[PDB]
Design a protein around this ligand. Structure first.
Ligand code: ZN
Ligand code: ZN
Ligand code: ZN
Lengths: 56, 6, 57, 56
């Protein structure tokens, strides 16, 4: 059943990176914004590393 | 529904 | 008249979410205790999405 | 320049319809939260009418 979960942008907290990443609905529900978030935590395999450019 | 009274 | 309904916390049953949401008096009276509840069912537009962080308790 | 706007779900307020719609980032920014929202206000031409089924 559809839970109608928004796709949210989160920023990598690696000071060398600081890139913004758009999360799936699933990851947007799962993320805990009171803990640090880093690119490697993104389950989107297109955009899941600080070496990868921000999405267009 | 799982609930808690305030 | 005034119905004197207390506000309750209800837990989202989206397995990805599981956040606790504090309902208005009106929503708290309406909650069907025998059915699943999910964040989108909250009429509180500040906390009505699984993406929105849990209010402090 | 990317404004990092979330893609949000909104419910149609036509009482005959009540379908949920997932908005583009641009439409998500533009939503007036002080006014009712209805399907026809979606610029997504796939899901922009009350007579169209809710998206999977
Ligand atoms: Zn990064
Ligand atoms: Zn939820
Ligand atoms: Zn509609």
């Amino acid at each position: 059943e559809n839970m109608y979960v928004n796709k949210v942008w989160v920023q990598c907290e690696n000071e060398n990176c600081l890139k913004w990443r758009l999360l799936s609905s699933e990851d947007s529900a799962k993320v805990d914004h009171d803990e640090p978030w880093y690119c490697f935590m993104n389950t989107d395999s297109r955009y899941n590393n600080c070496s990868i450019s921000e999405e267009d | 529904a799982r609930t808690k009274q305030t």
